[PDB]
Design a protein around this ligand. Structure first.
Ligand SMILES: CCCCCCCCCCCCCCCCCC(=O)OC[C@H](COP(=O)(O)OCCN)OC(=O)CCCCCCCCCCCCCCCCC
Ligand code: HEM
Ligand SMILES: Nc1ncnc2c1ncn2[C@@H]1O[C@H](COP(=O)(O)OP(=O)(O)OP(=O)(O)O)[C@@H](O)[C@H]1O
Ligand SMILES: Nc1ncnc2c1ncn2[C@@H]1O[C@H](COP(=O)(O)OP(=O)(O)OP(=O)(O)O)[C@@H](O)[C@H]1O
Ligand SMILES: [Mg+2]
Ligand SMILES: [Mg+2]
Lengths: 202, 220, 55, 231, 220, 202
């Protein structure tokens, strides 16, 4: 009952325990942020939520079944952008975004790049894009994806004040329809406090 | 989704202009040329040495292209294929492996007419050379993939991880060179082609799953 | 005024080494013509894209 | 007074028609003087008529690599873009000339050797020259950003030209270590010497025309966005 | 910031990148073992091809190892040495090449006594081979440094690097194989070693500067 | 007066001119922030100031002489931490910082890492650290270097609110003694407007 759910997630690296007993249920239209300091298990928790890393002791469930059980209807509606954006650095911003789209209509890939602020830099190889223009290539998928679950690991890493505002406004309307956005930002969000469900690592 | 898109992407990241398509051909030509400059210019000895020359060149090309297969993806995008792409990870591995073959196996097979007369082989020797390159070069990317996936992405990895990359290709090299050598004496090499075909049939079935499991182990 | 052959390609075009002589001629003319044609066609294609980007 | 704006495009365009006409005329006269009028030697018979067609390519492959080295030197110390761009304009032409020399010498020694390929000093030296040419071509095309390919290509050309005499002398000594010397000797004969000179000059003019055309194309590729290309 | 500090840092980085420095060693062993397996009980023919295959294996192993010379520096810290460290960039290149040789060319010299027993050479043949690797592998590293410096921005990890610096090693291959072959006849090898030392001295002087220029080109 | 000086710096990458005729002199005590969006030539200008990239036109003079002429004495007083941290992932945090200290290290490097916020992670490889803890290894040099010139390219890329506070206080007493901090940031600095010299790419 409900989308992505943690069931007593436990994880410890080296000798410190990052978290234990993490049990939260996420429903539709819910904007959440994984609050934590620098060094906590925030990226670790996000990778557990995407299924990239198996929990030490616990399980994550999508629609009621474990992520490894389905693995096919979960990746279908799931968009995760981590610390590494996941874009080929020699390909241009278009053919790199063309790969991640459902069909690559090239009329929506150009529209998404323009909506992400990367207008006029579609055909330049992304290794020549500066530092946040490279980050905007991965973030341009936010305007293409039909996924109902967004997993973002510091999406404002090198984005300017206008790009952060446009990203925040894009994430706001996605959660207004049916979407779920799990976020980890060290920069405070410029959105109302009642619209964010902060869950800590305890 | 759409396995073939992954295949075409791995092709695109390899060749970025039409002029780079011939680069593996030039690499193979230079590697072939390296041997007369060392052994000597006599054509009879180059013929008896030819199986070793060809398969050393094939192994070198496969080793060079195997590092590009997975290592470059950990820095940016080895994920978004485990996490995304509702096709199973073995399918992604298979697409990457056939792209790796097409950037390494095809250039040596396409150029095999030309390098079968620089060394001095006849038609039958070239026929067996091509039939073992077609049947053994794709394997070089299958059984080398699980070892490469671990080595290029498992931090704090020891020397023993290198036992699963090069020394696993010893039986393949031995049997392929033996097939070519027996073809040199104009002998029925049918028994050696069965061994190479049983390796290709068996390895292509287990390598994508083994590589997928290795990638799952290494990412965590 | 004084040719090196008694008559035409019945004597010319075959000095006993016709295959080797003409293979060299063909195999040198073809790459030169390929270079010339590629340069001209690439110039034309570049000028086409200059006007193409003007849209 | 060296101006070096995009006016080099106009200067290249001015010389291309006359240079091409001259190259065509001199090649035609040199290949009709040879290949049909000049006598043939006693030993090789009419297979010797490949001098007019193989020797100029072999000469001008080395010549084009030397010109590329000079251009790379000029573009390295003085920080010149066109000198680095001239290397890329000349590299395919030199590679084609090396290929022509290789395939016309193999077709020439085949009646004598009995095989289409012999690992002698001549073939090996031109083979490694072609390896240098294709390495330069691949390095220039491997860079997404221009004006950085041309500096890398120029440095590679300088490295290769420094090592070129070493490689040539090593290959020449490697041949004597195994077989000993060339086939018999070098001889041109007075009657077959003038058409060979005309053919060499013709290949020089053809390479000059081709490098002007390629330089013009590369100038367009570089400045494909400047307002000067409003044409 | 010091010369020896950079040397030790590169040594420490290479040691923790294990299974990447052992792969060239495995390739060298497989190359030098495959040919004696192909050619049967023919001691005369083995002696004729032993120097050539040994030095071709050394060259190809050096090309396999040359990938990591500057590769894991452009992503993080190829700068901080150009931009900092008042030590001149040619000196930084020299230290890095020395540290690369300590893990690339030095193991081949340590493994040389076992190669002599495997290939059935004499004590004098081993002496000449060891002197050839000692004077030839630093030349290999110095010749391959400019190529990897030029191709570091491209991060091909493939055939491109093997067509830039492989033609440049032809004189070294020729004279090394000539020295080793003349050792088989129990002939004096003083002149060959003198030529190899001359090549090492010539390459070790200009290669740091060429590599520094190439690195400056690639960093921008 | 005039530790660094820009002398009509020009950079025209493709059809876009990032800046033209830039001239600014920086004496001791200057806390200078380069302002711009994600496409403006901020990293390009910083790499020009460090001498990594040579300008299309103009030149940078350290103390009155061009950078290439005094490259030996310029690198003595200079600190670059760019978008790439400049540290080895397979080496530990202490070993990476051990490389950047002139003398007395393995005892001052430990204290410097404590100031940067990496107490207890000194003997852990960098690749096993978090995204923001990996940035703190390079930022630990701020507590070790005696360089007078600091040129920082987004030092708050993945740093927490407490770590950003310590970095701001760190490069605030550096400029009080007579040092120079050249900065490019997207997060707004928590210091008075009078303490920062905003210069844009005009
Ligand atoms: C005989 C068939 C034709 C001969 C080959 C002709 C090649 C001509 C190349 C050419 O005109 O293109 C130039 C090319 C790239 O030019 P560029 O303008 O920079 O391209 C822009 C974006 N890629 O630059 C190049 O890549 C130039 C490469 C030149 C290499 C010459 C080698 C010829 C090899 C011929 C292969 C066919 C025969 C196979 C072997 C025969 C011998 C047994
Ligand atoms: C098979 C491949 C061959 C290659 C790659 C080759 C290469 C060359 C080169 C590089 C030159 C330049 C002049 C020089 O180096 O001194 C040259 C010239 C010449 N070649 Fe060859 N050669 C080949 C075969 C032959 C053969 C079989 C002949 C038979 C006669 C021949 C006859 C000549 C002559 C006479 C010259 C004139 C040299 C001069 O006057 O400077 N070549 N060739
Ligand atoms: N090789 C290259 N590397 C970086 N930028 C390049 C290159 N070639 C061209 N450029 C262009 O030069 C401009 C320089 O921008 P710069 O890198 O200073 O942006 P930035 O302000 O650092 O961005 P961010 O704030 O995201 O770090 C970029 O817009 C880019 O498009
Ligand atoms: N391969 C690894 N990558 C990252 N952290 C690791 C790894 N292995 C162990 N760890 C440890 O696990 C802990 C979890 O760190 P995590 O990556 O969750 O930090 P984070 O909260 O994402 O930091 P930031 O907010 O800067 O990204 C870290 O303290 C780290 O020491
Ligand atoms: Mg994190
Ligand atoms: Mg930047």
């Amino acid at each position: 009952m409900g989308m992505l759910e943690a069931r007593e997630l436990l994880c410890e690296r080296d000798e410190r325990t990052l978290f234990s007993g993490l049990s939260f249920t996420l429903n539709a239209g819910e904007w959440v942020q994984i609050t934590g300091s620098n060094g906590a298990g925030k990226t670790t928790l996000l990778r557990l939520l995407t299924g990239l890393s198996r929990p030490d002791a616990g399980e994550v469930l999508w629609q009621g079944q474990p992520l490894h059980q389905v693995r096919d209807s979960y990746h279908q509606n799931l968009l995760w952008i981590g610390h590494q954006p996941g874009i080929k650095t020699r390909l241009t911003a278009l053919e790199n975004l063309h790969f991640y789209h459902r069909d690559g209509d090239t009329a929506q890939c150009l529209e998404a790049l323009a909506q992400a602020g990367l207008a006029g830099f579609e055909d330049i190889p992304v290794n020549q894009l500066s530092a946040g223009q490279q980050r905007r290539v991965a973030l341009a998928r936010l305007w293409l994806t039909r996924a109902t679950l967004w997993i973002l690991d510091e999406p404002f890493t090198a984005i300017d004040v206008n790009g952060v505002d446009r990203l925040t406004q894009r994430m706001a309307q996605h959660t207004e329809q049916g979407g779920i956005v799990i976020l980890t930002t060290h920069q405070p969000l410029n959105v109302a406090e009642s619209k964010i469900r902060r869950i800590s690592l305890t | 989704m759409m396995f073939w898109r992954i295949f075409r992407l791995e092709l695109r990241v390899a060749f970025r202009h039409s002029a780079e398509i011939a680069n593996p051909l030039w690499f193979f030509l230079i590697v072939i040329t390296l041997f007369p400059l060392s052994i000597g210019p006599e054509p009879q000895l180059l013929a008896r040495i030819a199986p070793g020359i060809i398969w050393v060149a094939a192994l070198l090309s496969s080793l060079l292209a195997l590092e590009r297969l997975f290592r470059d993806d950990l820095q940016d995008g080895s994920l978004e294929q485990l996490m995304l792409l509702p096709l199973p990870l073995p399918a992604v591995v298979l697409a990457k492996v056939m792209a790796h073959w097409m950037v390494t196996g095809l250039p040596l097979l396409i150029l095999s007419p030309l390098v079968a007369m620089l060394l001095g082989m006849d038609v039958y020797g070239w026929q067996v050379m091509a039939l073992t390159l077609l049947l053994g070069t794709p394997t070089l990317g299958f059984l080398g993939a699980p070892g490469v996936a671990l080595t290029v992405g498992l931090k704090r990895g020891g020397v023993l991880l290198s036992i699963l990359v090069l020394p696993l290709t010893i039986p393949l090299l031995i049997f392929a060179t033996a097939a070519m050598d027996a073809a040199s004496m104009h002998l029925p090499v049918d028994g050696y082609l069965a061994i190479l075909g049983a390796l290709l049939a068996g390895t292509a079935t287990l390598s994508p799953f083994a590589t997928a499991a290795a990638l799952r182990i290494s990412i965590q | 005024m004084t040719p090196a052959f008694a008559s035409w390609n019945e004597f010319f075009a075959m000095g006993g080494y016709a295959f080797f002589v003409w293979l060299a001629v063909v195999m040198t003319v073809i790459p030169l013509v390929v270079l010339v044609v590629h340069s001209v066609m690439q110039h034309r294609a570049i000028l086409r894209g200059v006007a193409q980007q003007r849209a | 007074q060296l101006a070096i704006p995009p006016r080099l495009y106009q200067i290249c365009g001015w010389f291309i028609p006359w240079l091409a006409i001259a190259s065509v005329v001199v090649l035609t006269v040199g290949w009709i003087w040879g290949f049909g009028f000049a006598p043939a030697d006693y030993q090789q018979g009419n297979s010797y008529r490949i001098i007019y067609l193989h020797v100029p390519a072999a000469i001008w492959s080395m010549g084009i690599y030397a010109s590329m080295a000079v251009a790379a030197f000029i573009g390295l110390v003085w920080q010149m873009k066109m000198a680095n761009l001239a290397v890329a304009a000349m590299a395919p032409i030199g590679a084609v000339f090396t290929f022509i020399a290789l395939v016309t010498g193999s077709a020439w020694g085949k009646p004598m050797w009995g095989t289409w390929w012999v690992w002698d000093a001549r073939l090996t030296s031109e083979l490694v020259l072609l390896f240098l040419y294709v390495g330069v071509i691949a390095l220039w095309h491997a860079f997404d950003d221009r004006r950085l390919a041309g500096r890398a290509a120029g440095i590679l050309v300088l490295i290769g030209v420094v090592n070129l005499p070493i490689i040539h002398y090593s290959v020449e000594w490697w041949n004597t270590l195994h077989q000993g010397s060339t086939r018999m000797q070098q001889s041109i004969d007075p009657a077959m010497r003038s058409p060979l000179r005309w053919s060499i000059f013709g290949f020089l003019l053809l390479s000059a025309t081709l490098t002007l055309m390629r330089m013009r194309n590369l100038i367009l590729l570089m400045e494909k966005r400047r307002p000067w290309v409003s044409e």
